[PDB]
Design an enzyme around this catalytic site. Structure first.
Site, PDB file in Angstrom:
ATOM      1  N   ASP A 102       0.788  -1.240   0.000  1.00  0.00           N
ATOM      2  CA  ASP A 102       0.000   0.000   0.000  1.00  0.00           C
ATOM      3  C   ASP A 102       0.820   1.292   0.000  1.00  0.00           C
ATOM      4  O   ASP A 102       0.419   2.298   0.609  1.00  0.00           O
ATOM      5  CB  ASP A 102      -0.985   0.010   1.180  1.00  0.00           C
ATOM      6  CG  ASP A 102      -2.137   0.968   0.957  1.00  0.00           C
ATOM      7  OD1 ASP A 102      -2.503   1.681   1.910  1.00  0.00           O
ATOM      8  OD2 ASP A 102      -2.669   0.985  -0.175  1.00  0.00           O
ATOM      9  N   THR A 103       1.983   1.279  -0.653  1.00  0.00           N
ATOM     10  CA  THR A 103       2.772   2.503  -0.776  1.00  0.00           C
ATOM     11  C   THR A 103       3.063   2.795  -2.243  1.00  0.00           C
ATOM     12  O   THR A 103       2.431   3.650  -2.852  1.00  0.00           O
ATOM     13  CB  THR A 103       4.121   2.400   0.008  1.00  0.00           C
ATOM     14  OG1 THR A 103       4.849   1.250  -0.442  1.00  0.00           O
ATOM     15  CG2 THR A 103       3.877   2.281   1.544  1.00  0.00           C
TER      16      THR A 103
ATOM     17  N   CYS B 282      12.258   5.841   5.949  1.00  0.00           N
ATOM     18  CA  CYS B 282      11.856   4.636   5.231  1.00  0.00           C
ATOM     19  C   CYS B 282      13.007   3.701   4.862  1.00  0.00           C
ATOM     20  O   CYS B 282      13.974   4.134   4.236  1.00  0.00           O
ATOM     21  CB  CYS B 282      11.149   5.061   3.954  1.00  0.00           C
ATOM     22  SG  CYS B 282      10.661   3.713   2.955  1.00  0.00           S
ATOM     23  N   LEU B 283      12.899   2.433   5.247  1.00  0.00           N
ATOM     24  CA  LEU B 283      13.874   1.404   4.867  1.00  0.00           C
ATOM     25  C   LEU B 283      13.601   0.786   3.496  1.00  0.00           C
ATOM     26  O   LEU B 283      14.484   0.159   2.880  1.00  0.00           O
ATOM     27  CB  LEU B 283      13.904   0.311   5.930  1.00  0.00           C
ATOM     28  CG  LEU B 283      14.534   0.768   7.251  1.00  0.00           C
ATOM     29  CD1 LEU B 283      14.305  -0.292   8.271  1.00  0.00           C
ATOM     30  CD2 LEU B 283      16.046   1.022   7.101  1.00  0.00           C
ATOM     31  N   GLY B 284      12.377   0.982   3.010  1.00  0.00           N
ATOM     32  CA  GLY B 284      11.968   0.461   1.709  1.00  0.00           C
ATOM     33  C   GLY B 284      12.229   1.405   0.546  1.00  0.00           C
ATOM     34  O   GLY B 284      11.925   1.081  -0.623  1.00  0.00           O
TER      35      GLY B 284
END
Ligand code: MNR
Ligand SMILES: [K+]
EC number: 1.14.15.1
Length: 405
Positions: free
Chosen positions: A242-243, A348-350
């Site tokens: 959901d990003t 954010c790590l993603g």
């Protein structure tokens, strides 16, 4: 409805903004949130919506609050309060110092070396989906690409079957943009219900997938618990599902509406990474927050212990104090200032995975389908919440203008 105004909040600071259904939504979600930056509106306001909470409306305040975890805690980061209280994902429900040990583990499964590993599959999936759509001359971009591209990548990384996507996507959406059928707590418990057996199985017989790695991981040299692994994997699911899925739709809606900007990237493909960053600013889409750990005077406003504050990551990059003409998309923008991937200890790590997905999409889409538009007569509708999105995105093009690669 409007929650009664607490004694400590002065009336001149009330601005009743609803983060789940903002007044100006039809103008576009970012535009609806930007109403908080109109000249009549204070830097920090109180809304009586969603149980009552503060909103920081400017980049300076948002960054300052994200930096100061001593006053603004991640323990209860979602509005409304029931959601924030139920929220226990790791590392996002924790403050430093305790938070930090978990970041290295999450980085193992979604950070740069892993993105580099998956680069081929990412490329290959984008090319495959786009080539399948190319001769059709039309698609529903949200279901035909925005969803399957990042989600199938995530399901691969996580070693989860693609047949589970509809269920998991429904649950994740209830946590960020609830339709009212589930409380945050119910949706979270359903996600945990899904994960508990998988985590158990993979601690017994570890594989090479992300869930296996987290579940058998160490944090600062000691074994992660089953419970911790569960609360970390739950977060990863939400991030995977959901990003990027939503952001891709905002970006492709813009490109469909802007022939000039598409042409720029077609003729100058070296600008794609910069275009990605500028799109990340203009179409920023996350808004969570923090909880006050004590009474605290912030920018001349008395915040009370336990008060929630929405710190919309979205608003920093739209703030004209940070970026001149912030609603204009300028791929040549000199200093692209934003907090789209957050700010402070919870960055954010993603984000490397997200950027790779965005950049691969723009490159591979524009290579094959350089010229496309919104379906004639369609009216694009956005949706707002913790992560904002696009309801549907019908695109059209002439297959004769396309290229098979
Ligand atoms: C599958 C993995 C992930 C993907 C894809 C992804 C994609 C994206 C993305 C896409 C365009 C945007 C925008 C985005 C935005 C964020 N993201 Mn991200 N995100 N994201 C994480 C995994 C992922 N994200 C994790 C894990 C954290 C928690 C780090 C921590 O709390 O220490 C995080 C944190 C965050 C935060 C910080 C929240 C806070 O401070 O409370 C923001 C904002
Ligand atoms: K909590």
């Amino acid at each position: 409805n409007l929650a009664p105004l607490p004694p400590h909040v002065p009336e001149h600071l009330v601005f009743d903004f609803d983060m789940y259904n903002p007044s100006n939504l039809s103008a576009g979600v970012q535009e609806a949130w930007a109403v908080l930056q109109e000249s009549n509106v204070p830097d920090l306001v109180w809304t009586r919506c969603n149980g009552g909470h503060w909103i920081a409306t400017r980049g300076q305040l948002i960054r300052e609050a994200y930096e100061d975890y001593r006053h603004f805690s991640s323990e209860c980061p979602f509005i409304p309060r029931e959601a924030g209280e139920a929220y226990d994902f790791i590392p996002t429900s924790m403050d430093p110092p305790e938070q930090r040990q978990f970041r290295a583990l999450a980085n193992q499964v979604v950070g740069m070396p892993v993105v580099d590993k998956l680069e081929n599959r990412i490329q290959e999936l984008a090319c495959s989906l786009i080539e399948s759509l190319r001769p059709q001359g039309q698609c529903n971009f949200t279901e035909d690409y925005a969803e399957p591209f990042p989600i199938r990548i995530f399901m691969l990384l996580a070693g989860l079957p693609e047949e589970d996507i509809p269920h998991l996507k429904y649950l994740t959406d209830q946590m960020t943009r609830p339709d009212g059928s589930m409380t945050f707590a119910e949706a979270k418990e359903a996600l945990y219900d899904y994960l508990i057996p998988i985590i158990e199985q993979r601690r017994q017989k570890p594989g090479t997938d992300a869930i296996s790695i987290v579940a058998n991981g160490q944090v600062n040299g000691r074994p992660i618990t089953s419970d911790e692994a569960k609360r970390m994997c739950g977060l990863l699911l939400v991030g995977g599902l959901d990003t990027v899925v939503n952001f891709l739709s905002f970006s492709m809606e813009f490109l469909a509406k802007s022939p000039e900007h598409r042409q720029e990237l077609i003729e100058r493909p070296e600008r794609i990474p910069a275009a990605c960053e500028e799109l990340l600013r203009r179409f920023s889409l996350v808004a969570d927050g923090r909880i006050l750990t004590s009474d605290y005077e912030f920018h001349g406003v008395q915040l009370k212990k336990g008060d929630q504050i929405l710190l919309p990551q979205m608003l920093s990059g739209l703030d004209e104090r940070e970026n001149a003409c912030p609603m204009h998309v300028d791929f040549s923008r000199q200093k692209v200032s934003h907090t789209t991937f957050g700010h402070g200890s919870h960055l954010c790590l993603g984000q490397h995975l997200a950027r790779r997905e965005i950049i691969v999409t723009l490159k591979e889409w524009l290579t094959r389908i350089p010229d496309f538009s919104i379906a004639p007569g369609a009216q694009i509708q956005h949706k707002s919440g913790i992560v904002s999105g696009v309801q549907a995105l019908p695109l059209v093009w002439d297959p004769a203008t396309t290229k098979a690669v």
